[PDB]
Amino acid sequence: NGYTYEDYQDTAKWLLSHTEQRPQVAVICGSGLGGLVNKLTQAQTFDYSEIPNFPESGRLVFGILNGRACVMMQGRFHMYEGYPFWKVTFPVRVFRLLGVETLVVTNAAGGLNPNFEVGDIMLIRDHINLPGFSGENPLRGPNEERFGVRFPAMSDAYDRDMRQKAHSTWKQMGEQRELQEGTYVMLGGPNFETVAECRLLRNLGADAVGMSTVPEVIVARHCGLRVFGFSLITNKVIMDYESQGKANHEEVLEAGKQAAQKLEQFVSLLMASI
Amino acid sequence: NGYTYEDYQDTAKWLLSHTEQRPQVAVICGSGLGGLVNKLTQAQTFDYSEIPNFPESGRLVFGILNGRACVMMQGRFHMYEGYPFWKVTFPVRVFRLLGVETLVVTNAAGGLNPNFEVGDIMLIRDHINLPGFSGENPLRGPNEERFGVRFPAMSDAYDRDMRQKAHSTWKQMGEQRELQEGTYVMLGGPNFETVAECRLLRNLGADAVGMSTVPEVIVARHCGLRVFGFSLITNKVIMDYESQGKANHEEVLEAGKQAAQKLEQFVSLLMASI
Amino acid sequence: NGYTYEDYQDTAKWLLSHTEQRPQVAVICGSGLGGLVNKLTQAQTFDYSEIPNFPESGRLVFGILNGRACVMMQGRFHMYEGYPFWKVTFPVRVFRLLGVETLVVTNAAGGLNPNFEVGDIMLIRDHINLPGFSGENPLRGPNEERFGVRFPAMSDAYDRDMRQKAHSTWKQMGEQRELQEGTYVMLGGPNFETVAECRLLRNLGADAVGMSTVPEVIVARHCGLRVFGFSLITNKVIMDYESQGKANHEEVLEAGKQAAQKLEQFVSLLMASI
Ligand SMILES: O=c1[nH]cnc2c([C@@H]3O[C@H](CO)[C@H]4O[C@@H](CP(=O)(O)O)O[C@H]43)c[nH]c12
Ligand SMILES: O=c1[nH]cnc2c([C@@H]3O[C@H](CO)[C@H]4O[C@@H](CP(=O)(O)O)O[C@H]43)c[nH]c12
Ligand SMILES: O=c1[nH]cnc2c([C@@H]3O[C@H](CO)[C@H]4O[C@@H](CP(=O)(O)O)O[C@H]43)c[nH]c12
Ligand SMILES: [Mg+2]
Ligand SMILES: [Mg+2]
Ligand SMILES: [Mg+2]
Ligand SMILES: [Zn+2]
Ligand SMILES: [Zn+2]
Ligand SMILES: [Zn+2]
C-alpha cells in the first residue's frame, strides 16, 4: 500500500471542511449510471483533481437522493489503466472515515449465464476474484488494524437483506424482465475474452464477467461497510466458434445508454431500503 | 508500459535506414524453428544488441522466403526471464510501424490433449491467457490510440483462412500424422507443471501448455496484424501419479531438433498462403 | 530476484561461524507447530533480526530432534504481508548452502475435501500454484545454475518414500482419525474465500487451500532438496449459501493450539524416517 493512514485522514478532513454534507451511503457509479449524480438535491461537486491525494480520472458528488444523504463517484478507477489496487480503492476508505455505512457498487458486464439478455440487471450475490488468486489484492501489505482485521471473511460480502428488498422494489416498478442474480467474476482486461476463456469462466460457476468492483468490495468489507452491488448485462459473450458476433465497446456503451433511465430509477428507489 | 510512442518510431527509423528490405510478414521463431533464418535469400542480420531500444536476448533477420518479404526473430523473450510484457512484445509494435501486415508465431508446448504425440504440430485456434486474468497484460496502462483501441476483441485472433490453407499445405506435403488444431494455454513458468495442475489445465479446455506467444498475439491484434500460430508438441505432460515419466528440457530440445526440417518446410510453404 | 549469489553465501557464512551445529534437516513451522523449537536439545536460537540479509518477521533455531541435526524456522514469511517470493524463500537457499538435504514444510489450511474434519492432518501429495500461473514465481528472473536448472520439474516434488513412512508412523501413534493425503492449492490472501471461489477450487481438484508453502517447495526442489509437507485442517470452508458458518482466524488459531501436542509428536517421530 502506498498511502499512509494519515493520507486518508487528510483527505477526509479536506472534504469535511469544504461541504456541510454528511453522507451515510456511498455509490460508485459503473457503466450506464453516470447520470445518477444529476438526480441529487442540495448537491455539491468536487472534480477528483481538486481533492488532495485522489487518483487521477471524474467527479465526487455529495447530495440527497430519495431521502438519503449520499456521496457518489461519477467515474471509477481500473486495474487495466495501470492503477494498483491500493489506488483503485482509496476512496472507499475515505468514505468510511467520513461516516458512510453502506456502499452501493455497480458495473457493466458480459453475460456468461445463457439465460441472460442484453439490458438485464444482475444482483451480485457473490464474486470470484481471479487477480486475488495470484496475490493482486488491495489488502496486500501490513494490515492497518484501524480499518480492519488481517484475515477478513468474504463469504457474506453481499448483504442478504438488501438483495431481498431489491426484488420487492423491482416488482413495484413492474418490469417485464425478471431481476437476475448471480456470481460476478473479475479479471484484469482490457481485451475482451476469447471463446475458450468464456467457456472456462462459465464452468468456474460465473454468471457475469467484468473488470472492476471486486477490489472495492474487499476493501469495503474489511472496514465494516454494508455492501450491495449489481451488473448491467451489456453483451452476451461469444461461446462458440461458428458465431459471427464479437464483443465491441461501441455496442456496450449503447446498451448502457439504453438502460440509463431504468438504472437511475432502480437505485433511487432502493435508497429507502438501506 | 515503459516505452514511449517515440521509442518505437526511433527503432523503426533506425531499421529502415540500415536495410533496403521492406517486410510484409514477421515470424517469431519458437523452439525448433531457430534455423529458419538460414533459408532466407538476400538476407540481412542485426544482432538484437545493435538495435536501439531492443530488449536483451538473439538476432533480427530480414530476407525473402518463398517469394515473400519477411523479418524474423531468431529467439524471443519470456516472462520467466524477468521481462515485463511491454518488453516481451516491443518488437511486435516495431514490426507494425515497418509496414508488416501478418504475424506468424510459433512455440514448443506440452501436450494436454491425450491424442497428441511428440512431434505433432498443433495449429493454434484459440488461447487461454492465465496471466491476463490477474492483470499481467502488455496493454495494461493508458491506451495508445495510434496503435489500437482501449478494449480490443480477441475471440477472432487466429485467422480462419490461414488455418484452412494450413491443412491444404499439409496434405501436399503428404505427412503421415494429421495436423492437430486446438487451444493453447499460457502460464508463467519456468518450472514444469505438477500432475494436479496438468489435470486442471486439461479440464479448462486447453490442448497444449506453454510459456509464451499469447502476449505477442494480444499486441498484434491490438495494432491490426493478421495472426497465425502453431505449437510443436515436444512432450506429453504427466497426468497421473503412477507414471514414471517426468518433463525435462533436454528431451524437449531433442524433439525440437527432430522436427526442425519439417517445421522449416511447413513454414516456407505456407508463405504463399499469406 | 533481489538477492545476489554472494548475499546467500554471506548469510550462510555468518551462521556457520556463530554455531557449531551442522543441520541435515530444515523444518519450516506452520500454524500449530511453533512450539516444536522447544523440543530441540543442544539448541541455539538466532532472532531473524540478528541474521544479516534475513527478511523481517521470528527465530531460527538449531538443535537435535530425535537424533537428527535440524534447523527450524519458528515463523515464516507470506506474500500477503507484501513480501516478494524471492524474499519469502530466501532461507531455503541458505539452508542448502549450510548442507541441509531435506526440507519439512507445514501449514494450516481450509478443508475443501468434504471428508476432512477440523484437526485432521493432510499429507501434501501434490500442489496447485495459482500465483505461478500468472508468473509470480520465486524462480522468475535469470537462472542461477549454481543452485539448479532453468526448467525444473515439479511432478515429483513431494517425496513418495517419506509419505509412505508417515502412514507407518501414524499407526504406531495409534491415532483414531486416519491420516489424510491430498492436493494443496495456494492463493495469495489475506481474505478468506467466497463460496463461489471455494466451489471453484474444489472442482480444480484441490483438497486443502492455504496461503503459503508452495513457493518454498519450488525453490527447495530447484536446489535439490528432498521435500515432505503436510497441512493441519483448521476449518471446513463454506461451500453453500444457506450455511451460517464463516471462516474466522480466531477459530483457526484455536484449532492450531488443540493440535499442537499431536503435531509435535508426529514430526519428532518422523525424524527417524528421513
Ligand atoms: O464482455 C465483457 N468482458 C469483460 N468486461 C466487460 C465489460 C465492462 O465494460 C468495459 C468494456 O466495454 C470494461 O470496463 C469496465 C467497466 P465498469 O467500470 O466495470 O462498469 O469493465 C468492463 C462489458 N462487457 C464485458
Ligand atoms: O510441458 C511443458 N509445460 C510448459 N512449457 C513447455 C514447453 C516450452 O519449452 C520450454 C521448456 O522446455 C519453455 O520455454 C518456452 C519455449 P517457446 O519460446 O514458447 O518455444 O515455453 C516452454 C515445452 N514443454 C512444456
Ligand atoms: O480457509 C482458509 N483459506 C485460506 N487460508 C487458510 C488458512 C491459513 O491460516 C491463516 C489464516 O487463518 C493464513 O495464513 C497462512 C498460515 P500458514 O503459514 O500457511 O500456516 O495461510 C492461511 C487457514 N484456513 C484457511
Ligand atoms: Mg491530484
Ligand atoms: Mg541495447
Ligand atoms: Mg535485518
Ligand atoms: Zn478550500
Ligand atoms: Zn548506422
Ligand atoms: Zn558475531
JSON list of N, CA and C in Angstrom, two decimals, chain C residues 36-80:
[
{"chain": "C", "resi": 36, "resn": "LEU", "atom": "N", "xyz": [7.41, -26.43, 18.43]},
{"chain": "C", "resi": 36, "resn": "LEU", "atom": "CA", "xyz": [8.36, -27.52, 18.20]},
{"chain": "C", "resi": 36, "resn": "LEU", "atom": "C", "xyz": [9.81, -27.16, 18.54]},
{"chain": "C", "resi": 37, "resn": "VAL", "atom": "N", "xyz": [10.18, -25.89, 18.43]},
{"chain": "C", "resi": 37, "resn": "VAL", "atom": "CA", "xyz": [11.55, -25.48, 18.73]},
{"chain": "C", "resi": 37, "resn": "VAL", "atom": "C", "xyz": [11.92, -25.74, 20.19]},
{"chain": "C", "resi": 38, "resn": "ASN", "atom": "N", "xyz": [10.92, -25.94, 21.04]},
{"chain": "C", "resi": 38, "resn": "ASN", "atom": "CA", "xyz": [11.16, -26.18, 22.46]},
{"chain": "C", "resi": 38, "resn": "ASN", "atom": "C", "xyz": [11.56, -27.63, 22.76]},
{"chain": "C", "resi": 39, "resn": "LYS", "atom": "N", "xyz": [11.45, -28.50, 21.77]},
{"chain": "C", "resi": 39, "resn": "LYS", "atom": "CA", "xyz": [11.80, -29.90, 21.95]},
{"chain": "C", "resi": 39, "resn": "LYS", "atom": "C", "xyz": [13.23, -30.22, 21.54]},
{"chain": "C", "resi": 40, "resn": "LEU", "atom": "N", "xyz": [13.90, -29.25, 20.92]},
{"chain": "C", "resi": 40, "resn": "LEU", "atom": "CA", "xyz": [15.27, -29.43, 20.47]},
{"chain": "C", "resi": 40, "resn": "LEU", "atom": "C", "xyz": [16.28, -29.43, 21.62]},
{"chain": "C", "resi": 41, "resn": "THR", "atom": "N", "xyz": [17.29, -30.29, 21.52]},
{"chain": "C", "resi": 41, "resn": "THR", "atom": "CA", "xyz": [18.34, -30.36, 22.53]},
{"chain": "C", "resi": 41, "resn": "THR", "atom": "C", "xyz": [19.62, -29.73, 21.97]},
{"chain": "C", "resi": 42, "resn": "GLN", "atom": "N", "xyz": [20.48, -29.24, 22.86]},
{"chain": "C", "resi": 42, "resn": "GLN", "atom": "CA", "xyz": [21.73, -28.58, 22.47]},
{"chain": "C", "resi": 42, "resn": "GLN", "atom": "C", "xyz": [21.37, -27.43, 21.52]},
{"chain": "C", "resi": 43, "resn": "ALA", "atom": "N", "xyz": [20.19, -26.87, 21.75]},
{"chain": "C", "resi": 43, "resn": "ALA", "atom": "CA", "xyz": [19.65, -25.80, 20.92]},
{"chain": "C", "resi": 43, "resn": "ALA", "atom": "C", "xyz": [20.36, -24.45, 20.97]},
{"chain": "C", "resi": 44, "resn": "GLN", "atom": "N", "xyz": [20.27, -23.74, 19.85]},
{"chain": "C", "resi": 44, "resn": "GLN", "atom": "CA", "xyz": [20.83, -22.39, 19.74]},
{"chain": "C", "resi": 44, "resn": "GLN", "atom": "C", "xyz": [19.88, -21.58, 18.87]},
{"chain": "C", "resi": 45, "resn": "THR", "atom": "N", "xyz": [19.41, -20.47, 19.42]},
{"chain": "C", "resi": 45, "resn": "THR", "atom": "CA", "xyz": [18.47, -19.60, 18.73]},
{"chain": "C", "resi": 45, "resn": "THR", "atom": "C", "xyz": [19.07, -18.29, 18.23]},
{"chain": "C", "resi": 46, "resn": "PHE", "atom": "N", "xyz": [18.60, -17.84, 17.08]},
{"chain": "C", "resi": 46, "resn": "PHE", "atom": "CA", "xyz": [19.01, -16.56, 16.49]},
{"chain": "C", "resi": 46, "resn": "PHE", "atom": "C", "xyz": [17.72, -15.87, 16.07]},
{"chain": "C", "resi": 47, "resn": "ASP", "atom": "N", "xyz": [17.43, -14.68, 16.60]},
{"chain": "C", "resi": 47, "resn": "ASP", "atom": "CA", "xyz": [16.24, -13.96, 16.15]},
{"chain": "C", "resi": 47, "resn": "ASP", "atom": "C", "xyz": [16.53, -13.62, 14.68]},
{"chain": "C", "resi": 48, "resn": "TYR", "atom": "N", "xyz": [15.51, -13.60, 13.83]},
{"chain": "C", "resi": 48, "resn": "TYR", "atom": "CA", "xyz": [15.76, -13.27, 12.43]},
{"chain": "C", "resi": 48, "resn": "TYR", "atom": "C", "xyz": [16.44, -11.91, 12.32]},
{"chain": "C", "resi": 49, "resn": "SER", "atom": "N", "xyz": [16.12, -11.01, 13.25]},
{"chain": "C", "resi": 49, "resn": "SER", "atom": "CA", "xyz": [16.69, -9.66, 13.24]},
{"chain": "C", "resi": 49, "resn": "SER", "atom": "C", "xyz": [18.21, -9.60, 13.42]},
{"chain": "C", "resi": 50, "resn": "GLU", "atom": "N", "xyz": [18.81, -10.65, 13.97]},
{"chain": "C", "resi": 50, "resn": "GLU", "atom": "CA", "xyz": [20.25, -10.64, 14.16]},
{"chain": "C", "resi": 50, "resn": "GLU", "atom": "C", "xyz": [21.05, -11.22, 12.99]},
{"chain": "C", "resi": 51, "resn": "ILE", "atom": "N", "xyz": [20.35, -11.89, 12.07]},
{"chain": "C", "resi": 51, "resn": "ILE", "atom": "CA", "xyz": [20.99, -12.51, 10.91]},
{"chain": "C", "resi": 51, "resn": "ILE", "atom": "C", "xyz": [21.06, -11.60, 9.69]},
{"chain": "C", "resi": 52, "resn": "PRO", "atom": "N", "xyz": [22.27, -11.26, 9.22]},
{"chain": "C", "resi": 52, "resn": "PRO", "atom": "CA", "xyz": [22.41, -10.38, 8.05]},
{"chain": "C", "resi": 52, "resn": "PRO", "atom": "C", "xyz": [21.62, -10.88, 6.84]},
{"chain": "C", "resi": 53, "resn": "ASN", "atom": "N", "xyz": [20.94, -9.96, 6.15]},
{"chain": "C", "resi": 53, "resn": "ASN", "atom": "CA", "xyz": [20.15, -10.26, 4.94]},
{"chain": "C", "resi": 53, "resn": "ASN", "atom": "C", "xyz": [18.78, -10.92, 5.13]},
{"chain": "C", "resi": 54, "resn": "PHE", "atom": "N", "xyz": [18.50, -11.44, 6.32]},
{"chain": "C", "resi": 54, "resn": "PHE", "atom": "CA", "xyz": [17.21, -12.10, 6.57]},
{"chain": "C", "resi": 54, "resn": "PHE", "atom": "C", "xyz": [16.01, -11.15, 6.49]},
{"chain": "C", "resi": 55, "resn": "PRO", "atom": "N", "xyz": [14.88, -11.63, 5.93]},
{"chain": "C", "resi": 55, "resn": "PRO", "atom": "CA", "xyz": [13.70, -10.76, 5.84]},
{"chain": "C", "resi": 55, "resn": "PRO", "atom": "C", "xyz": [13.15, -10.52, 7.25]},
{"chain": "C", "resi": 56, "resn": "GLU", "atom": "N", "xyz": [12.36, -9.46, 7.41]},
{"chain": "C", "resi": 56, "resn": "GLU", "atom": "CA", "xyz": [11.79, -9.16, 8.73]},
{"chain": "C", "resi": 56, "resn": "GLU", "atom": "C", "xyz": [10.63, -10.11, 9.02]},
{"chain": "C", "resi": 57, "resn": "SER", "atom": "N", "xyz": [10.39, -10.37, 10.30]},
{"chain": "C", "resi": 57, "resn": "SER", "atom": "CA", "xyz": [9.30, -11.27, 10.69]},
{"chain": "C", "resi": 57, "resn": "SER", "atom": "C", "xyz": [8.01, -10.49, 10.95]},
{"chain": "C", "resi": 58, "resn": "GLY", "atom": "N", "xyz": [10.01, -13.89, 14.94]},
{"chain": "C", "resi": 58, "resn": "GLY", "atom": "CA", "xyz": [10.60, -14.90, 14.09]},
{"chain": "C", "resi": 58, "resn": "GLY", "atom": "C", "xyz": [11.99, -15.28, 14.57]},
{"chain": "C", "resi": 59, "resn": "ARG", "atom": "N", "xyz": [12.24, -16.58, 14.70]},
{"chain": "C", "resi": 59, "resn": "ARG", "atom": "CA", "xyz": [13.54, -17.06, 15.17]},
{"chain": "C", "resi": 59, "resn": "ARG", "atom": "C", "xyz": [13.99, -18.30, 14.41]},
{"chain": "C", "resi": 60, "resn": "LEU", "atom": "N", "xyz": [15.31, -18.42, 14.24]},
{"chain": "C", "resi": 60, "resn": "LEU", "atom": "CA", "xyz": [15.93, -19.56, 13.56]},
{"chain": "C", "resi": 60, "resn": "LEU", "atom": "C", "xyz": [16.56, -20.38, 14.69]},
{"chain": "C", "resi": 61, "resn": "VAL", "atom": "N", "xyz": [16.14, -21.63, 14.85]},
{"chain": "C", "resi": 61, "resn": "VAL", "atom": "CA", "xyz": [16.67, -22.44, 15.93]},
{"chain": "C", "resi": 61, "resn": "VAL", "atom": "C", "xyz": [17.35, -23.72, 15.45]},
{"chain": "C", "resi": 62, "resn": "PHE", "atom": "N", "xyz": [18.60, -23.90, 15.86]},
{"chain": "C", "resi": 62, "resn": "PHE", "atom": "CA", "xyz": [19.40, -25.08, 15.52]},
{"chain": "C", "resi": 62, "resn": "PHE", "atom": "C", "xyz": [19.37, -26.02, 16.73]},
{"chain": "C", "resi": 63, "resn": "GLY", "atom": "N", "xyz": [19.34, -27.33, 16.47]},
{"chain": "C", "resi": 63, "resn": "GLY", "atom": "CA", "xyz": [19.31, -28.28, 17.57]},
{"chain": "C", "resi": 63, "resn": "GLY", "atom": "C", "xyz": [19.09, -29.71, 17.10]},
{"chain": "C", "resi": 64, "resn": "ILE", "atom": "N", "xyz": [19.07, -30.64, 18.05]},
{"chain": "C", "resi": 64, "resn": "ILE", "atom": "CA", "xyz": [18.86, -32.05, 17.73]},
{"chain": "C", "resi": 64, "resn": "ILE", "atom": "C", "xyz": [17.43, -32.46, 18.10]},
{"chain": "C", "resi": 65, "resn": "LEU", "atom": "N", "xyz": [16.77, -33.15, 17.19]},
{"chain": "C", "resi": 65, "resn": "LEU", "atom": "CA", "xyz": [15.41, -33.63, 17.42]},
{"chain": "C", "resi": 65, "resn": "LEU", "atom": "C", "xyz": [15.39, -35.11, 17.08]},
{"chain": "C", "resi": 66, "resn": "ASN", "atom": "N", "xyz": [15.07, -35.93, 18.07]},
{"chain": "C", "resi": 66, "resn": "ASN", "atom": "CA", "xyz": [15.01, -37.38, 17.89]},
{"chain": "C", "resi": 66, "resn": "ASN", "atom": "C", "xyz": [16.18, -37.92, 17.06]},
{"chain": "C", "resi": 67, "resn": "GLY", "atom": "N", "xyz": [17.40, -37.53, 17.45]},
{"chain": "C", "resi": 67, "resn": "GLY", "atom": "CA", "xyz": [18.60, -38.00, 16.78]},
{"chain": "C", "resi": 67, "resn": "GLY", "atom": "C", "xyz": [19.05, -37.33, 15.49]},
{"chain": "C", "resi": 68, "resn": "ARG", "atom": "N", "xyz": [18.31, -36.34, 15.00]},
{"chain": "C", "resi": 68, "resn": "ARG", "atom": "CA", "xyz": [18.70, -35.67, 13.76]},
{"chain": "C", "resi": 68, "resn": "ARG", "atom": "C", "xyz": [19.07, -34.20, 13.99]},
{"chain": "C", "resi": 69, "resn": "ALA", "atom": "N", "xyz": [20.12, -33.75, 13.31]},
{"chain": "C", "resi": 69, "resn": "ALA", "atom": "CA", "xyz": [20.56, -32.36, 13.41]},
{"chain": "C", "resi": 69, "resn": "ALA", "atom": "C", "xyz": [19.58, -31.55, 12.56]},
{"chain": "C", "resi": 70, "resn": "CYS", "atom": "N", "xyz": [18.92, -30.57, 13.17]},
{"chain": "C", "resi": 70, "resn": "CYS", "atom": "CA", "xyz": [17.92, -29.76, 12.47]},
{"chain": "C", "resi": 70, "resn": "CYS", "atom": "C", "xyz": [18.12, -28.25, 12.62]},
{"chain": "C", "resi": 71, "resn": "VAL", "atom": "N", "xyz": [17.47, -27.51, 11.73]},
{"chain": "C", "resi": 71, "resn": "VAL", "atom": "CA", "xyz": [17.46, -26.06, 11.77]},
{"chain": "C", "resi": 71, "resn": "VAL", "atom": "C", "xyz": [15.99, -25.75, 11.50]},
{"chain": "C", "resi": 72, "resn": "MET", "atom": "N", "xyz": [15.36, -25.00, 12.39]},
{"chain": "C", "resi": 72, "resn": "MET", "atom": "CA", "xyz": [13.94, -24.71, 12.23]},
{"chain": "C", "resi": 72, "resn": "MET", "atom": "C", "xyz": [13.60, -23.24, 12.20]},
{"chain": "C", "resi": 73, "resn": "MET", "atom": "N", "xyz": [12.61, -22.91, 11.37]},
{"chain": "C", "resi": 73, "resn": "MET", "atom": "CA", "xyz": [12.12, -21.55, 11.26]},
{"chain": "C", "resi": 73, "resn": "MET", "atom": "C", "xyz": [10.86, -21.47, 12.11]},
{"chain": "C", "resi": 74, "resn": "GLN", "atom": "N", "xyz": [10.92, -20.69, 13.18]},
{"chain": "C", "resi": 74, "resn": "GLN", "atom": "CA", "xyz": [9.75, -20.51, 14.03]},
{"chain": "C", "resi": 74, "resn": "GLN", "atom": "C", "xyz": [9.14, -19.23, 13.48]},
{"chain": "C", "resi": 75, "resn": "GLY", "atom": "N", "xyz": [8.22, -19.40, 12.54]},
{"chain": "C", "resi": 75, "resn": "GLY", "atom": "CA", "xyz": [7.58, -18.28, 11.89]},
{"chain": "C", "resi": 75, "resn": "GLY", "atom": "C", "xyz": [8.08, -18.21, 10.45]},
{"chain": "C", "resi": 76, "resn": "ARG", "atom": "N", "xyz": [7.18, -18.00, 9.50]},
{"chain": "C", "resi": 76, "resn": "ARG", "atom": "CA", "xyz": [7.57, -17.93, 8.09]},
{"chain": "C", "resi": 76, "resn": "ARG", "atom": "C", "xyz": [7.11, -16.61, 7.48]},
{"chain": "C", "resi": 77, "resn": "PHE", "atom": "N", "xyz": [7.38, -16.42, 6.19]},
{"chain": "C", "resi": 77, "resn": "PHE", "atom": "CA", "xyz": [7.01, -15.18, 5.51]},
{"chain": "C", "resi": 77, "resn": "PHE", "atom": "C", "xyz": [5.88, -15.43, 4.52]},
{"chain": "C", "resi": 78, "resn": "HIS", "atom": "N", "xyz": [5.00, -14.45, 4.32]},
{"chain": "C", "resi": 78, "resn": "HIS", "atom": "CA", "xyz": [3.87, -14.62, 3.41]},
{"chain": "C", "resi": 78, "resn": "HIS", "atom": "C", "xyz": [3.74, -13.53, 2.36]},
{"chain": "C", "resi": 79, "resn": "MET", "atom": "N", "xyz": [3.30, -13.93, 1.18]},
{"chain": "C", "resi": 79, "resn": "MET", "atom": "CA", "xyz": [3.09, -13.00, 0.09]},
{"chain": "C", "resi": 79, "resn": "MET", "atom": "C", "xyz": [2.11, -11.91, 0.51]},
{"chain": "C", "resi": 80, "resn": "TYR", "atom": "N", "xyz": [1.09, -12.27, 1.29]},
{"chain": "C", "resi": 80, "resn": "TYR", "atom": "CA", "xyz": [0.09, -11.28, 1.70]},
{"chain": "C", "resi": 80, "resn": "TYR", "atom": "C", "xyz": [0.61, -10.17, 2.60]}
]
